[PDB]
Design an enzyme around this catalytic site. Structure first.
Site, PDB file in Angstrom:
ATOM      1  N   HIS A  26      28.620  65.648  25.201  1.00 35.59           N
ATOM      2  CA  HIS A  26      27.552  65.895  23.982  1.00 35.59           C
ATOM      3  C   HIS A  26      27.306  67.118  23.866  1.00 35.59           C
ATOM      4  CE1 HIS A  26      27.010  61.552  24.441  1.00 35.59           C
ATOM      5  NE2 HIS A  26      26.771  61.549  25.595  1.00 35.59           N
ATOM      6  N   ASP A  57      34.862  57.474  27.378  1.00 34.16           N
ATOM      7  CA  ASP A  57      33.617  57.479  27.723  1.00 34.16           C
ATOM      8  C   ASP A  57      32.803  56.458  26.766  1.00 34.16           C
ATOM      9  OD1 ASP A  57      30.436  58.184  27.738  1.00 34.16           O
ATOM     10  OD2 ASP A  57      31.291  59.543  29.295  1.00 34.16           O
ATOM     11  N   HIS A  69      29.659  56.367  25.683  1.00 35.48           N
ATOM     12  CA  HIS A  69      28.991  57.054  24.573  1.00 35.48           C
ATOM     13  C   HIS A  69      29.925  57.719  23.525  1.00 35.48           C
ATOM     14  CE1 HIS A  69      26.536  56.565  28.196  1.00 35.48           C
ATOM     15  NE2 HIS A  69      25.436  56.030  26.944  1.00 35.48           N
ATOM     16  N   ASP A  91      31.815  55.161  32.589  1.00 33.00           N
ATOM     17  CA  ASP A  91      30.661  54.550  32.123  1.00 33.00           C
ATOM     18  C   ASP A  91      30.724  53.166  31.273  1.00 33.00           C
ATOM     19  OD1 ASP A  91      30.949  56.289  29.961  1.00 33.00           O
ATOM     20  OD2 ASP A  91      28.802  57.101  30.323  1.00 33.00           O
ATOM     21  N   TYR A 130      28.296  56.040  36.431  1.00 34.83           N
ATOM     22  CA  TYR A 130      27.201  56.105  37.131  1.00 34.83           C
ATOM     23  C   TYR A 130      27.100  55.185  38.183  1.00 34.83           C
ATOM     24  CZ  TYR A 130      26.326  59.175  33.150  1.00 34.83           C
ATOM     25  OH  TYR A 130      26.553  60.024  32.212  1.00 34.83           O
TER      26      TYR A 130
HETATM   27  N1  LIG Z   1      16.384  57.334  36.379  1.00 32.74           N
HETATM   28  C1  LIG Z   1      17.334  56.341  35.630  1.00 32.74           C
HETATM   29  C2  LIG Z   1      17.941  56.706  34.323  1.00 32.74           C
HETATM   30  C3  LIG Z   1      17.637  57.560  33.717  1.00 32.74           C
HETATM   31  C4  LIG Z   1      18.318  57.774  32.391  1.00 32.74           C
HETATM   32  C5  LIG Z   1      19.075  56.503  32.037  1.00 32.74           C
HETATM   33  N2  LIG Z   1      19.701  56.979  30.684  1.00 32.74           N
HETATM   34  C6  LIG Z   1      19.418  58.183  29.764  1.00 32.74           C
HETATM   35  O1  LIG Z   1      18.544  58.888  30.313  1.00 32.74           O
HETATM   36  N3  LIG Z   1      20.124  58.235  28.614  1.00 32.74           N
HETATM   37  C7  LIG Z   1      20.112  57.283  27.540  1.00 32.74           C
HETATM   38  C8  LIG Z   1      18.843  57.071  26.745  1.00 32.74           C
HETATM   39  C9  LIG Z   1      18.362  58.608  26.230  1.00 32.74           C
HETATM   40  C10 LIG Z   1      16.774  58.349  25.703  1.00 32.74           C
HETATM   41  O2  LIG Z   1      16.662  57.299  24.960  1.00 32.74           O
HETATM   42  C11 LIG Z   1      20.882  59.383  28.292  1.00 32.74           C
HETATM   43  C12 LIG Z   1      22.229  59.466  28.592  1.00 32.74           C
HETATM   44  C13 LIG Z   1      22.760  58.290  29.165  1.00 32.74           C
HETATM   45  C14 LIG Z   1      24.316  58.231  29.422  1.00 32.74           C
HETATM   46  C15 LIG Z   1      25.086  59.558  29.006  1.00 32.74           C
HETATM   47  C16 LIG Z   1      26.584  59.436  29.131  1.00 32.74           C
HETATM   48  O3  LIG Z   1      26.879  59.171  30.143  1.00 32.74           O
HETATM   49  N4  LIG Z   1      27.273  60.028  28.075  1.00 32.74           N
HETATM   50  O4  LIG Z   1      28.399  60.373  27.795  1.00 32.74           O
HETATM   51  C17 LIG Z   1      24.447  60.376  28.386  1.00 32.74           C
HETATM   52  C18 LIG Z   1      23.018  60.586  28.311  1.00 32.74           C
HETATM   53  C19 LIG Z   1      19.133  55.548  32.531  1.00 32.74           C
HETATM   54  C20 LIG Z   1      18.676  55.530  33.908  1.00 32.74           C
HETATM   55  K   LIG Z   2      33.610  57.809  23.668  1.00 35.20           K
HETATM   56 ZN   LIG Z   3      28.874  58.273  28.758  1.00 31.12          ZN
END
Ligand SMILES: NCc1ccc(NC(=O)N(CCCCO)Cc2ccc(C(=O)NO)cc2)cc1
Ligand SMILES: [K+]
Ligand SMILES: [Zn+2]
Ligand SMILES: [Cl-]
Ligand SMILES: [K+]
Length: 357
Positions: free
Chosen positions: A133, A171, A173, A264, A304
């Site tokens: 990202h 991934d 995302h 993920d 995760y």
């Molecule tokens: N504390 C539990 C928790 C915290 C965060 C999240 N999810 C997020 O923080 N994200 C998604 C939503 C962002 C704001 O709307 C950010 C995020 C999620 C996944 C990834 C990834 O793995 N990408 O490669 C990156 C950023 C869930 C639970």
């Molecule tokens: K991807």
């Molecule tokens: Zn991801």
């Protein structure tokens, strides 16, 4: 050993000081490494040492301003760390984050070097924080520097500027940073499979859609495979590989393959909501090993569910070591929306790839 492995417990020191349960946990990398020990994979691998990326190596993809700001965080008081992280979308920062981002990038440079010098055939890098990202000029989505993009530029810096590098980003995302870094570049073919949901899935930009094919000389060298409306798993990922990833990749004829290997999209991941199995990941790994005379570097991104990412990455290392690949069901019908996604990508990329015509 034919397979390299990099892992350094120092990358655990990056932590969330305001939510110790934030899912981008230190123990993501130690759990994957422990699983390698339990499955007796570690001793079958050539250990490659971690090192720091240099500021000069970070400048391969990142602005002097962005490098300076993240570097400035290494001695910040907690109030300043908190304010700095809040300048970005979905970042936390500790005094160790900068060093850990440097170790992740340098570990992957040492791994790409070991492959390209012929010390190993292929390699796995159990690294955090993740990278995909991260933009030229900003941090985003748990990522400070774009490890995979930097590794592709590092590989070119020790072979030739136009070394054909494929980056497969499995991934769940979109790697927005990787796509943006190489958007005008025909030397680095970026292929991403990602949940999209018409922009409701992070990082919530139309940049992830199937019609973003690349810019200028880069037209055709950015392949987005977006998933909508559908709990996608082995059948949809296998179909994406059969119809899009492998035909395009063989036509591109990469000299090095980098996997932006988030886990993920795995069954049990609470952020991805998808059901790719450890055998699914083994199948995708073995498919990519047919490219670049087997020169494949698997870089951890997201993932995760600690148990799911441990098992899933271990099964990728197992394939790199030459273990028997799984025989999966290619006849299972796809989710209707996945057929639509694959046909949208084929239509967008058939102008650029004779293998799709
Ligand atoms: N504390 C539990 C928790 C915290 C965060 C999240 N999810 C997020 O923080 N994200 C998604 C939503 C962002 C704001 O709307 C950010 C995020 C999620 C996944 C990834 C990834 O793995 N990408 O490669 C990156 C950023 C869930 C639970
Ligand atoms: K991807
Ligand atoms: Zn991801
Ligand atoms: Cl072992
Ligand atoms: K590109």
């Amino acid at each position: 050993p034919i397979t390299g492995l990099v892992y350094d417990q120092r990358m655990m020191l990056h932590h969330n000081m305001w939510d110790s349960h934030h899912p981008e946990l230190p123990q993501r990398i130690s759990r994957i490494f422990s699983r390698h020990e339990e499955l007796r994979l570690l001793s079958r691998c050539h250990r490659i040492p971690a090192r720091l990326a240099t500021e000069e190596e970070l400048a391969l993809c990142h602005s002097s301003k962005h490098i300076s700001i993240i570097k400035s965080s290494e001695h910040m008081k907690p109030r300043d760390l908190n304010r700095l992280g809040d300048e970005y979308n979905s970042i936390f920062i500790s005094n160790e984050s900068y060093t850990c981002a440097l170790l992740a990038a340098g570990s992957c440079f040492n791994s790409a070097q070991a492959i390209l010098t012929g010390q190993v055939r292929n390699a796995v890098a159990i690294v955090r924080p993740p990278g995909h990202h991260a933009e030229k000029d900003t941090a985003c989505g748990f990522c400070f520097f774009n490890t995979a993009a930097l590794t592709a530029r590092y590989a070119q810096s020790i072979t030739r500027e136009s070394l054909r590098v494929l980056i497969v980003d499995w991934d769940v995302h979109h790697g927005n940073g990787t796509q943006h870094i190489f958007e005008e570049d025909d030397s680095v073919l970026y292929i991403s499979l990602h949940r999209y949901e018409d922009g409701a899935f992070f990082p919530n930009s139309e940049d992830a859609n199937y019609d973003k094919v690349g810019l200028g000389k880069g037209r055709g060298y950015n392949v987005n495979i977006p998933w909508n409306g559908g709990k996608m798993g082995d059948p949809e990922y296998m179909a994406a590989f059969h119809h899009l990833v492998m035909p395009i990749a063989r036509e591109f004829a990469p000299e090095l393959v980098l996997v932006s290997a988030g886990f993920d999209a795995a069954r049990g991941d609470p952020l991805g909501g998808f059901q790719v199995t450890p055998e699914g990941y083994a199948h995708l790994t073995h498919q990519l090993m047919s490219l670049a005379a087997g020169r494949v570097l698997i870089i951890l991104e997201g993932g995760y569910n600690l148990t799911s990412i441990s098992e899933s990455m271990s099964m990728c290392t197992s394939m790199l070591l030459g273990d028997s690949p799984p025989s999966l069901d290619h006849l299972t019908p796809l989710k209707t929306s996945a057929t639509v996604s694959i046909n949208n990508v084929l239509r967008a990329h058939a102008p650029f790839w004779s293998s799709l015509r």
